[PDB]
Amino acid sequence: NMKRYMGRDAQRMNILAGRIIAETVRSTLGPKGMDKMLVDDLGDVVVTNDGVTILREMSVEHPAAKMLIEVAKTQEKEVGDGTTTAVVVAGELLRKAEELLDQNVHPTIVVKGYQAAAQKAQELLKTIACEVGAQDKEILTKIAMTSITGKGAEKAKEKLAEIIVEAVSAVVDDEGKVDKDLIKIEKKSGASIDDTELIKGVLVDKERVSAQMPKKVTDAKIALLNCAIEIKETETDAEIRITDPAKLMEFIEQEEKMLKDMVAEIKASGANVLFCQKGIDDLAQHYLAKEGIVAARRVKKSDMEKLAKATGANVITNIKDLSAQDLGDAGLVEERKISGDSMIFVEECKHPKAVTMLIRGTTEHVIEEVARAVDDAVGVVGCTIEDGRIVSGGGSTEVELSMKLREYAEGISGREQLAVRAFADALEVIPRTLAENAGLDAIEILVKVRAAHASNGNKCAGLNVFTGAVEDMCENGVVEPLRVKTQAIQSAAESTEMLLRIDDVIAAE
Amino acid sequence: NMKRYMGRDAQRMNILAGRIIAETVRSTLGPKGMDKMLVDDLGDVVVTNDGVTILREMSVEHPAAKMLIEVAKTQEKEVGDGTTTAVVVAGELLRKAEELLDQNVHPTIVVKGYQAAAQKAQELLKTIACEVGAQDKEILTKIAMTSITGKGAEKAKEKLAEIIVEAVSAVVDDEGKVDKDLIKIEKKSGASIDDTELIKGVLVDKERVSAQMPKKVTDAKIALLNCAIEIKETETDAEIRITDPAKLMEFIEQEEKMLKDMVAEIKASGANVLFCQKGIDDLAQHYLAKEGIVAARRVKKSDMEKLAKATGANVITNIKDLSAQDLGDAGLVEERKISGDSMIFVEECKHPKAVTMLIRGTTEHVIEEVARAVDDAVGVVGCTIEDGRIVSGGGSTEVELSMKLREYAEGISGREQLAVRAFADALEVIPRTLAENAGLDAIEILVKVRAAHASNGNKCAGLNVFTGAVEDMCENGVVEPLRVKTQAIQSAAESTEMLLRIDDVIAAE
Amino acid sequence: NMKRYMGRDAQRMNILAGRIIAETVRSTLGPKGMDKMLVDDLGDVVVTNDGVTILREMSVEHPAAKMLIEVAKTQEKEVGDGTTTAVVVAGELLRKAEELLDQNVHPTIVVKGYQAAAQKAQELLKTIACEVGAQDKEILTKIAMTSITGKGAEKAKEKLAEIIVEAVSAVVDDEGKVDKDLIKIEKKSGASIDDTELIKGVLVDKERVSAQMPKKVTDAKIALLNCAIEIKETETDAEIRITDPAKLMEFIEQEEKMLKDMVAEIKASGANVLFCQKGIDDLAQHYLAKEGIVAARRVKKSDMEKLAKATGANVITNIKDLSAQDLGDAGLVEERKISGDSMIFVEECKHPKAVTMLIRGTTEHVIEEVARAVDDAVGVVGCTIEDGRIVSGGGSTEVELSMKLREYAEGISGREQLAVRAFADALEVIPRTLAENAGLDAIEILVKVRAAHASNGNKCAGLNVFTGAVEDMCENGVVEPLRVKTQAIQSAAESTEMLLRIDDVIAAE
Ligand SMILES: Nc1ncnc2c1ncn2[C@@H]1O[C@H](COP(=O)(O)OP(=O)(O)NP(=O)(O)O)[C@@H](O)[C@H]1O
Ligand SMILES: Nc1ncnc2c1ncn2[C@@H]1O[C@H](COP(=O)(O)OP(=O)(O)NP(=O)(O)O)[C@@H](O)[C@H]1O
Ligand SMILES: Nc1ncnc2c1ncn2[C@@H]1O[C@H](COP(=O)(O)OP(=O)(O)NP(=O)(O)O)[C@@H](O)[C@H]1O
Ligand SMILES: [Mg+2]
Ligand SMILES: [Mg+2]
Ligand SMILES: [Mg+2]
Asked: Which of A135, B191, C33, C53 stands 20 to 30 A from A202 (CA)?
């Protein structure tokens, strides 16, 4: 009871399971790579080139495969881009590993050399990484442009990269990190892809609470309330008792006087637009509309935190302590009807720490894929602002890193040496699969790039899938954050070091 | 409808199916190899080290595997020994092939280099094969001794090899081939393995037709009859009519006078032992016994052909034309009770062209495996008598053949060159798996043997699984017929060249 | 009841079914094409590059597909080679046809232009076919060599083509056709592919009827008997009656005297080897062996007709009329044990009209594919002897025929003109798919070959899959019988003209 694979069977069972889900994303890799169509049990379809979203949203049951998906799952988590490359490298480390295991090289020697090599790979990547200033907009734009390409050249429009760089640059909390959650991504239809705009504001999925209120306010002062604009019932249970018929109107007029007071306290701060997180009582909607104050009820807790950071307001839980300095400032607050639905556009803000990317396109599935292309572009721009180190793309720093590990291996005595050469040769899978998907001769090209790296220059030389020939990738404008490669290598090395240590499997049910 | 594997899937489906049944026999290879126990649906068990009998008598259903079994199945057919080596080489050619297919090397280029290399391998084996005289008994005994070992050192007893060489030497039809079917293998119990004897005669599974007949005849003259010693009924339908009561005894006495005549015609030739293929009439058994002539009825057609070639008789279909010169001559014809059953031992013949190997042992499954070790020993001795060329064993001519193919590959321009190096490296699987099964370090040993082959000497240097260190295999006495290696390589090369050409599979039901 | 497809659905149902089995063989086409592995319900596997054997032995159920298989099935029937090209052309005529049907071109107009174009294609092929002498052995050898290639360059060995040409040249019945059934193809194991020999004789699957008979006869005179060498029982029912006891021996001795007479009548002709179609009586086997006459009983009726044409004998049904001039003459008749089984080799004949091709190889599936390569080579050599006209290969006469039909289309007014241009463009599928399977750029190459055909030269210019560039195919030695192309085009044109006329389908069950 119940199923057990022994030694050479358990090792080949896993290595194969890893190689086989690594081959599932191989064809997506590069600008000349292809998309996959995934359907589930409900008939819901999603078409994408994003490696991790393919692996995450497909039913994988083999335990060794589930564990190599973790590599892509934590690559989007730490970087944003490079999910397909991390898995493909992990796959080719497994292939190159069984060639040693079939030559009787003990798994502990393989894993020893694999780790000695991934250590060297990290400290070799630090020396070959160009140093770049966190505000070099022309270089950040190339980094954003190289990320959108790879999902395809047609998605990579110039004006979209400039928009992305300007949005990531805005949400930087001095000093000095980039929060990916601060850039709100909204997906609406329209005849677009080119109509995707950067909104320096927030988009709230709510309408004006009363129709009598204005629908367009310019240079508006915005107040944010966590308090409920209703009657304040006491915590210790309370009940009123009326014995005089003339006391009826007393309590009602006193209660509705508490609502007149609250609306008059909001006008005292000078605020003409109001976003309440809790509910607003019906009488108070009438008094607000009479004052000319645009208000919205039951706004999401997450949208209140967006508005607060974007306009420059404060979330106040006590309407009595609403000061005039706790109001935010936005150049336009308007209720538009975009794509059928009506929403409140709070835009044109002065100094935003939160920003909305309105991603638009013709069909919902087109929109959803451009959205995934921006999540990747935001990830790499954020990584260059934090790290300040970039490397050349097009499989260029893999060839350079490959040849430097091979001459590092010559200086290693022992059979661990074979595992370091194996590791080096595995890295060359990125330049090779860029060529396969391009249509070009992978074997031939890999030799021209390898020979154009020997001695001194170039280091920045790699395959250009559009030109066909081997070009200088730095002068071309093909660049990635250092974190894309160091993470992809480390996570591929650590997960395959673990699978290789397995010699027995025990599967139930 | 119904199941189809495309391109990279179909190629990996087959290659894997071939590698996996090649790994099923890997552990049997060598003197330090292990046996397999095979059970079927009926509960009938057979334990063996013979590669082909393992592959033949196990339920293999994968079409690509069925086709690599053909390699073992036609190795026993053409050589007798080397069935495991042929499959293991074919397996390692498949492994080394997907390493090229995963680097995008077109299958047509792989198969081109594989064939160019197997051509060279054949004409390189001709030069390194020592020339040996078809009757060099001390060398033929070494060739028989090297074959029995490998099924295990304990089976390889000195006196058994000498017996086998003397039996194969006897059945050689001048000029000048060896028929494996002329050496009759019989399996009887007893407390043995050491009681296996060479019988210069035939063992007939019959008894004396009448108990009154002698049970031991020395220097007997043997007559062989294809004719039935009964009354000859005419082909055109005949019937007798009796009208006189005195005519009853006439026909009966006349009919039994035809049987007296037939027995008197056999005694006229001088024959005192008689083997009839058809039936012998009851009256004629009595007259034969009265003359002292030992006879046996309904002897198998195959046993008549054995007796004819062994004693030097002629199979006569007409009892009237039984000359005195058509009798065979054997030194002892006796009815013994060996292992419970009683049989006629026709032994001690002068000049036999047929011979019986009485293989004996304690249990039926022990006997059956010693029988398989003799079928192999008879195969290789027969191959040395026909070919007259031998090579050194212990993975010695694989290392030599490997290093010569590698320097032949340097003289090849093109990507076919990678397939020739692959082919060379595949051959080193025999020295390597000899070391695995021995317990020794396969990687280390393979280097000492490879380095002891460079320059001039030795060529005859290989791994000695008993010594541990690399020894000169020719001086040790470890030698195989050239045909064991040239066949194993050619059949491994032709079958894997065919699987590699497959890119689509269509499996029904 | 039950399933009916209307108009545009029925037309697309069929065209698709035809395009889809045409794509099933597309990858086999050319020397750089790949093999298929076919498995059935019983687990029996066959691996082949032969187009028709793929289509024949796979379960195809779609009626429109079954009808396009007829095209390959009658291409082997009339030519032997070109089965894949005929189907692939038929497929591309269907593809090019729906492009017209989707532009509203009536099916009757399509089929009109298709037929006007296939007429022109036939009379254009007559002018571009080189005239070749039926005994130009160097040209016949190139034709045999071009046929074996395409199933793969590795099968195409020089010495095998010379053997094939010599065998087809031998069986020519003056004047002056070639019967494919006169060249007997036999498949036996061995370590071969190179051990395939031409036997100027017949190989009979029988043994010597008596072991006492010789096993090797040189310059033997062979008698062939359709008569049974037994006692002749009368047709009108007969029965013998014996009343005298001395009459018993009378009839037996008289009956066996009829057998002594028959054997003495065969020795009278001077024949020392005998092949009987019926049975031979046991007494008569003894008398034959005593005379030294090698005989074989119950020889197949088909093998008797082989021997008769090969040795130069006559099949005699009356043993009394066996003249001395009715004996055949063969240089060697021997009973060998080839591949385990023992057979009678009747070889080295003087003037054979029947010939045996002993096709040998290492595994049964390797043998069976080389056998299919020879059936194709025999087909094309036979077509060149009969026709005396050949064309250039490598998709060369398709490009030339394509460009000549396109300028013939300009001289056609009406919408039928669109179907003639469609037909011309469909022919370019052979040069294009030769390039796809080679790996080369199909679009680019097709332009270099098309441009190297314009004006005068070359006409014999086409793609060389080994060189890569466009070469002169006549000087290279790449040539096909005219019948391969004219048959492939006619059968593709007639079957797709019929499918295109279908507008309604009625499928039951
Ligand atoms: N114009 C270009 N020329 C050559 N290589 C390029 C170009 N643009 C991008 N690349 C390279 O292509 C790879 C990116 O391919 P892509 O298919 O997007 O996969 P990924 O980024 O690894 N994963 P993911 O985008 O998360 O699905 C990187 O190695 C880039 O350096
Ligand atoms: N004393 C020895 N030392 C080293 N190698 C040996 C020795 N005896 C035999 N061999 C080698 O061991 C191999 C034979 O091993 P074995 O396990 O019998 O398989 P096989 O002969 O390939 N097939 P089979 O015997 O038909 O099951 C050959 O390559 C021999 O040359
Ligand atoms: N050396 C060569 N160079 C270029 N073309 C060649 C060469 N040899 C053969 N051909 C062409 O390749 C085609 C034959 O390919 P092949 O794959 O054998 O299919 P087929 O002959 O159409 N059918 P079949 O052989 O019956 O399976 C013909 O059009 C040949 O003229
Ligand atoms: Mg990307
Ligand atoms: Mg052996
Ligand atoms: Mg052909």
From this structure: A135
